[PDB]
Design a protein around this ligand. Structure first.
Ligand SMILES: [Cl-]
Ligand SMILES: [Fe+3]
Ligand SMILES: [Fe+3]
Ligand code: NA
Ligand code: NA
Lengths: 222, 222
């Protein structure tokens, strides 16, 4: 099916299924929960064709039995938000991390281009360290805090839909302009979000993102 | 030198300095902040001789410039608490993680026994996967969310003192009794804290901890 097709089209990058043991360094597949209340909301959305969209916190999705289950158990009673990231993207563009776990639920098939925070050296990450993981429709994953990640890359021509679950407030605008002291301070970009942008990605550079991906702006062919 | 003395006494454990590059898999050494406000408070304490003490949130230590600096920059605007863990312990006892970053600042020399969350299999962690890191007085470290850790082990006969900084609420008592569904739900122990206890530690098992460390309850000799 789509997995083998995509693997064949992407021999320029290491390209694995999300169920591969290689994913274990980056996160965990979550199997025990069902997400019908969230799927219902996501069915009412359209995928944008001009650029990706991200909404960090959606009342409809947070006002659900499943959000309470995930807050009290998966996040150990820390307050969460549930949003979405949908779009037409096929390129790496940037890599971010949070000092928290993220859940991504694939509402369509999609690909995640991932890295490790430990592979950042002096605010540079090399494209040649990226690994791609094919995530089938319906699979939920935890991305660990040490996993660099960004918007998905599409599998179907029509683009992708994903649910994104984070501690409440993550990705909100910064309310203060810190006096930068550490290397990582150069990467802080939104609340609980550190970002390394590809220099060829003008949409990020124009917002003041730190240019730090060295290498190709990887494309996922489909 | 205390480091080489301790390394020589602990050849049964892989034993490294916190400045060793191996620690970069588990966290980061924090170098550009000034913790003098907190050091002043910690100098006013002695070390308990009978058992460890952990106080999660100390108002005086949170009403500091450093607290604001670390909240707005290191934690990217997410609310934090500042407390301490001091005591006479020399054994592994347990291994915990949070889905957040922790800062430990060594007020005395101390040793951290660490593991990786990805090395847990069916809620078991093997003692032979533990690594020890010697942390000199004055060093501050970030422990990543994927780093299993617990209370320090002492270097000096008098015990150790450490500052512990976490997202606000971490380690509070759980307010809900979840339906257990995932393996990790068996480990949830306090707010934002999952614990794998050594089966010999009744102090932990009696409080509801999951016995899951297979192997010796490692002792750090000094
Ligand atoms: Cl990791
Ligand atoms: Fe993210
Ligand atoms: Fe901890
Ligand atoms: Na499970
Ligand atoms: Na329990």
């Amino acid at each position: 099916g789509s997995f083998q097709y995509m693997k064949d089209l992407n021999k320029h990058i290491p390209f694995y299924h999300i169920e591969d043991s290689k994913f274990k360094h980056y996160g965990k597949v979550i199997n025990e929960y069902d997400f019908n209340e969230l799927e219902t909301y996501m069915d009412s959305l359209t995928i944008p064709q001009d650029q990706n969209v991200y909404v960090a916190s959606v009342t409809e999705m947070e006002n659900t039995i499943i959000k309470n289950q995930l807050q009290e158990a998966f996040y150990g009673e820390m307050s969460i938000q549930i949003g979405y990231c949908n779009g037409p993207n096929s390129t790496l563009n940037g890599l971010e991390y949070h000092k928290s776990s993220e859940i991504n639920i694939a509402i369509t098939d999609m690909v995640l281009l991932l890295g490790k925070v430990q592979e950042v050296e002096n605010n540079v990450f090399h494209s040649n360290d990226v690994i791609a993981f094919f995530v089938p429709k319906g699979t939920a994953v935890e991305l660990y805090s040490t996993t660099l990640h960004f918007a998905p890359c599409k599998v179907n021509n029509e683009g992708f839909k994903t649910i994104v679950i984070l501690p409440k407030g993550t990705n909100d605008p910064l309310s203060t302009n810190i006096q930068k002291r550490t290397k990582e301070d150069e990467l802080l970009f939104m609340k609980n979000k550190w970002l390394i942008a590809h220099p060829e990605r003008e949409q990020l550079i124009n917002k003041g993102a730190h240019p730090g991906i060295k290498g190709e702006n990887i494309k996922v062919y489909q």
